[PDB]
């Protein structure tokens, strides 16, 4: 599967992967810089701890980097 | 000292205190709702954990509730 990967924010081929993922959470600068975003590929949807959100998807490049919309 | 206090965001007298404080940190909704803000009074400036910011001041009502400026 092809997925976007942080920190390069480029699409990489993950020949043995099955899902792309988008992990997001707030650090101390979340108000001014938005959520931290971790993009990657995995064989299965990774687990995350409380306060962290994850979305997994199963098509090439389905995890584009989500920028915050600027009012 | 008179200080603003959360969660009512009203001023009250703290006859034993000498500083007002503004304590701010990010929870998981920091990007959309801003930092959480705790206003109170104390006899001395409190200590806070990593990730938490605190500002203390020593004149009446010197800790007004800081809202986020909306572009």
């Amino acid at each position: 599967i092809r997925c976007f990967i942080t920190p390069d924010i480029t699409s990489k081929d993950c020949p043995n992967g099955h899902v792309c993922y988008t992990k997001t959470w707030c650090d101390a600068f979340c108000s001014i810089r938005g959520k931290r975003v971790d993009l990657g590929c995995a064989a299965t949807c990774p687990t995350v701890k409380t306060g962290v959100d994850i979305q997994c998807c199963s098509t090439d490049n389905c995890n584009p980097f989500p920028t915050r919309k600027r009012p | 000292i008179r200080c603003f206090i959360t969660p009512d965001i009203t001023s009250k007298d703290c006859p034993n205190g000498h500083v007002c404080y503004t304590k701010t940190w990010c929870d998981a909704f920091c990007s959309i709702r801003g930092k959480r803000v705790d206003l109170g009074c104390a006899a001395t400036c409190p200590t806070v954990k990593t990730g938490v910011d605190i500002q203390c001041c020593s004149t009446d009502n010197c800790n007004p509730f800081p809202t986020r400026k909306r572009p």
Partner: antibody
Amino acid sequence: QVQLVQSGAEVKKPGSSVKVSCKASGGTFSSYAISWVRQAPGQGLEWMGGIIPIFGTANYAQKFQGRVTITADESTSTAYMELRSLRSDDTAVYYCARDNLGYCSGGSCYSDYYYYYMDVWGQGTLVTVSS
Amino acid sequence: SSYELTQPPSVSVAPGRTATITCEGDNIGQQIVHWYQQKPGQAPVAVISSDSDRPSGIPERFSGSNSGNTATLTISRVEAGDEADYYCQVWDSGSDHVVFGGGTKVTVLE
């Protein structure tokens, strides 16, 4: 520690243009933003604009928008400021300066831009405009 | 169009007394204010970040506050070498601009 090394002084005619370079010696050039800040003789600091290479997005001060271009060459860790239609009050020392708050770290990146304080400054480049 | 920061051009301080430098703006308490020191012929140096934090190496006598319509840089027990220009700075997300105050020269009296 990271260092920013700028190109040398320039003397330019009115109406011409100048291009100043800022070479960032140190690992992570993509993840940190770079601003250009000038100081006219005897006067205060003035932001020209900045660039965040990992997002390829530049921002300019309105006083210079349309007259200025800021770029970053990632293979050479070099940032550039091009300022056109030069006039006499453009005579100044021009600094490049790094945004202290990196955009990526530990496998993740921030999702919005916001210029923080500037921690590393280049040595400055004197640009003088005259006839 | 863009957010304005107002600094007094000059401040006089007796040696070993407290210098206070203000930076005023419409509800500047909503902004994150940074402060730079600059000596003649040298590049600026950050001395306060994010209202009140000191970058590593900066002496403890530098402190900052920010509330309401005024942010303040305080230099306690000031020393001769603290004579310099001081600039406040914010990022104005409404106009996508870094804004500098006009600078304050702190003169330490003899």
